[PDB]
Ligand binder design. Structure first.
Ligand SMILES: CCCCCCCCCCCCCCCCCC(=O)O[C@H](COC(=O)CCCCCCCCCCCCCCC)COP(=O)(O)OCCN
Ligand SMILES: CC(C)CCC[C@@H](C)[C@H]1CC[C@H]2[C@@H]3CC=C4C[C@@H](O)CC[C@]4(C)[C@H]3CC[C@]12C
Ligand SMILES: CC(C)CCC[C@@H](C)[C@H]1CC[C@H]2[C@@H]3CC=C4C[C@@H](O)CC[C@]4(C)[C@H]3CC[C@]12C
Ligand SMILES: CC(C)CCC[C@@H](C)[C@H]1CC[C@H]2[C@@H]3CC=C4C[C@@H](O)CC[C@]4(C)[C@H]3CC[C@]12C
Ligand SMILES: CC(C)CCC[C@@H](C)[C@H]1CC[C@H]2[C@@H]3CC=C4C[C@@H](O)CC[C@]4(C)[C@H]3CC[C@]12C
Ligand SMILES: CC(C)CCC[C@@H](C)[C@H]1CC[C@H]2[C@@H]3CC=C4C[C@@H](O)CC[C@]4(C)[C@H]3CC[C@]12C
Ligand code: NA
Length: 586
């Protein structure tokens, strides 16, 4: 495999578990403000400098592959230059240099030590341990090369408020470099190389043990402090600020990873094709790291646009987790034999379901604690969320009995795909429900027969599939548990669902309690996109049975939607707890 992709998911939970635990502790006021700074300064003053000093003093510069460095640095520099120039050309002159300083830093600075290292470590503990030393020397070098340019830009903006015709050019440059030296990670690296020759790579045993204690305490503490500070940082920004965050996070998580792997392609000679492929994959994964929390600190120190910088830092942190997981799996696929590749899709489907079900259980708790499920549309959403819960629960059961006794397989397959067809069908039925409510008529909106049709019809389709279908116990994938008839049944279920959902949403436009039409319509539109992917996948297979082309990436994303849709309904209904039940639960 050369990546150890199976250990990625446990690492991501452990890393974002501490962040979530910190956020929960901060929200519940378990940790006071005075303890927050006590933990905050310890990480920045003791845990981090000890970690940085420990690695660089024993680092062997003789065996360092500097080719990977220049590829990452130029990729970072290219993103820095692109963002800086673009934000200079079309930003308002009053706050043009402040944006030109922090925004390129935002799109290039990454959380390599606190969060990047555990994912990099878990993937490359054994296959490529030399990849671990890169992250400790890529990050500080990047900070001393690009941040001075960004820091100088903020000094220009600061001195503009001071007026005085923007003089003291040497002072503006001087303060820019000075702030970089004052950064703990910059000078403690310089001390690391300093002691790398003075003390030599060998270090006293008692010193080494002391540095291990503080060093191993950084990642856990920094991640906990990360989520601790997230409390009350996301504000309802304007549309212009909302669009900018889309572009800035895209530059960090999409443009930067693509540039990092393309520069490695031509910088790195790659005598071994296998080693070249691993380096290119690692370069892609390094680019998709969240914005470092230290960028938000720079905004507060400079008193510039903290709100957009802090919100982007927090959002990019959570957004990167799906991107890190999905991208790392898709990079492995071109080097998978079709049979182990089948296990790869099942492995992704399994662990997406377990995180999705937790979101669905919370979403059901929010929706059923109140009397929302009494209401006409939210009753329809409740049925859809129950269907999604069984689909996620069915995949967990299916994973353990996919290669076991026949009687066990047939019960789980009925359980899994009767609910899966319901989620396809509930998308259309929910869209019909929105049409009736939007039409605003005296009609009684017969939810009684809707619920029967929502669950009964998928049961009939499964029953028809069983009496007319060919069993495959060898089939690892549940989509091919039956023959082409299952794809015909799946395509028919998807096909009819799209029209009834598509037409109903269209009729709402022609037509134009506490029912959220905008939230429900958004949910239906997002679900339909997943129906397009699944319908395309089924039609592609029927015309061409042979896989291997972009089908394999299409199959991966289809499996992501079928069991990840719960996350799509928790983003909408799970998150917005507000006070609809907060007094109720209190
Ligand atoms: C203010 C709103 C903030 C917007 C947030 C999003 C902004 C930028 C979006 C995402 C960054 C770009 C990367 C994701 C797009 C998909 C491409 C990608 O890199 O991920 C792929 C799919 O990964 C995913 O599953 C991504 C989806 C998961 C996260 C969703 C992204 C956007 C979510 C929006 C969040 C909104 C925040 C609300 C703010 C109030 C897999 O990568 P690959 O290119 O196939 O790798 C192999 C190439 N050799
Ligand atoms: C997404 C999957 C993995 C799990 C989702 C569950 C999350 C979103 C749930 C479960 C625990 C919840 C938290 C429990 C405790 C508190 C403290 C309270 O004073 C404010 C709400 C807050 C902060 C809740 C917010 C929502 C929460 C974080
Ligand atoms: C590479 C792609 C994906 C994105 C690149 C990022 C660049 C182009 C983005 C990210 C930050 C953005 C800037 C952020 C805020 C402002 C101020 C506003 O008054 C006008 C637009 C302006 C000036 C934006 C222009 C576009 C911008 C510079
Ligand atoms: C696809 C899976 C297996 C890989 C991603 C790992 C997990 C840890 C990811 C997937 C989606 C992520 C969630 C995305 C958004 C939020 C909202 C935020 O306010 C609380 C954390 C939370 C809930 C994230 C927690 C981490 C998360 C649950
Ligand atoms: C698991 C496979 C076999 C199919 C699922 C079984 C079906 C028949 C079950 C599971 C989900 C169930 C529904 C879940 C939610 C509701 C809404 C509630 O206000 C009345 C009961 C009702 C309408 C349930 C009726 C029975 C039901 C439709
Ligand atoms: C191959 C499968 C998906 C066949 C599709 C059957 C579904 C989409 C159809 C068949 C019968 C239809 C129902 C028949 C009549 C009504 C009454 C109307 O006032 C509300 C919608 C409702 C309740 C329809 C909803 C959609 C429905 C359930
Ligand atoms: Na940078």
């Amino acid at each position: 495999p050369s990546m150890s992709i199976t250990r990625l998911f446990p690492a991501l939970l452990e890393c974002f578990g501490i962040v979530l635990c910190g956020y929960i502790a901060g929200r519940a006021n378990v940790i006071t403000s005075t303890q927050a700074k006590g933990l905050g300064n310890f990480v920045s003053r003791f845990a981090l400098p000890a970690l940085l000093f420990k690695n660089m003093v024993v680092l062997n510069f003789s065996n360092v592959d500097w080719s990977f460095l220049y590829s990452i640095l130029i990729a970072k520099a290219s993103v820095f230059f692109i963002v800086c120039v673009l934000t200079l050309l079309v930003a308002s002159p009053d706050s043009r240099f402040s944006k030109a300083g922090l925004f390129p830093i935002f799109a290039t600075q990454s959380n390599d030590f606190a969060l990047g290292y555990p994912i990099v470590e878990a993937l490359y503990q054994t296959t490529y341990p030399e990849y671990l030393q890169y992250i400790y020397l890529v990050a500080p070098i990047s900070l001393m090369m690009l941040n001075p340019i960004g820091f100088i830009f903020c000094e220009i903006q600061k001195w503009k408020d001071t007026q005085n015709a923007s003089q003291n050019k040497i002072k503006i440059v001087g303060l820019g470099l000075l702030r970089v030296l004052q950064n703990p990670i910059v000078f403690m690296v310089f001390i690391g190389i300093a002691f790398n020759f003075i003390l030599d790579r060998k270090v006293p045993v008692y010193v080494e043990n002391f540095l291990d204690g503080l060093g191993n305490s950084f990642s856990g503490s920094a991640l906990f402090y990360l989520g601790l500070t997230m409390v009350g940082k996301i504000k309802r920004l304007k549309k212009s600020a909302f669009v900018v965050l889309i572009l800035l996070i895209t530059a960090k998580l999409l443009v930067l990873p693509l540039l990092c792997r393309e520069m490695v392609e031509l910088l790195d000679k790659g005598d071994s094709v296998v080693n070249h492929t691993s380096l290119s994959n690692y370069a892609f994964l390094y680019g998709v790291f969240p914005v470092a929390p230290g960028v938000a600190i720079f905004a507060t120190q400079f008193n510039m646009e903290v709100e957009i910088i802090t919100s982007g830092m927090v959002i990019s942190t959570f957004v990167s987790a799906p991107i890190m997981y999905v991208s790392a799996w898709l990079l492995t696929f071109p080097t998978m034999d079709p049979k182990p590749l089948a296990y790869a899709i099942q492995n992704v489907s399994f662990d997406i379901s377990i995180v999705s079900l937790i979101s669905l259980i919370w979403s059901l708790a929010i929706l059923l604690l109140s009397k929302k499920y009494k209401q006409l549309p939210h009753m329809l959403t409740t049925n859809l969320l129950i269907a999604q819960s069984i689909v996620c629960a069915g995949m967990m059961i299916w994973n353990f009995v996919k290669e076991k006794n026949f009687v066990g397989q047939i019960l789980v397959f009925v359980l899994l795909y009767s609910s899966l067809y319901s989620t396809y069908l509930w998308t259309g039925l929910l869209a019909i429900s929105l049409f009736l409510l939007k039409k605003r008529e005296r009609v009684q909106i017969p939810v009684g027969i809707i619920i029967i049709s929502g669950w009964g019809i998928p049961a009939l389709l499964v029953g028809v599939l069983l009496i007319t279908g060919k069993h495959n116990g060898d089939s690892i994938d549940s989509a091919f548990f039956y023959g082409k008839e299952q794809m015909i049944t799946t395509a028919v279920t998807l096909f009819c669902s799209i029209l009834i959902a598509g037409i109903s949403l269209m009729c709402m436009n022609q037509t134009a309690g506490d029912q959220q039409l905008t939230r429900h319509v958004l949910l239906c539109l997002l679900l339909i996109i997943g129906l397009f992917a699944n319908l395309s996948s089924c039609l592609w297979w029927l015309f061409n049975q042979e896989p291997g082309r972009l089908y394999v990436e299409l199959q991966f994303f289809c499996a992501v939607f079928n069991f990840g849709q719960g996350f799509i309904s928790f983003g909408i209904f799970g998150l917005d707890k507000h006070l609809i039940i907060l007094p109720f639960k209190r």
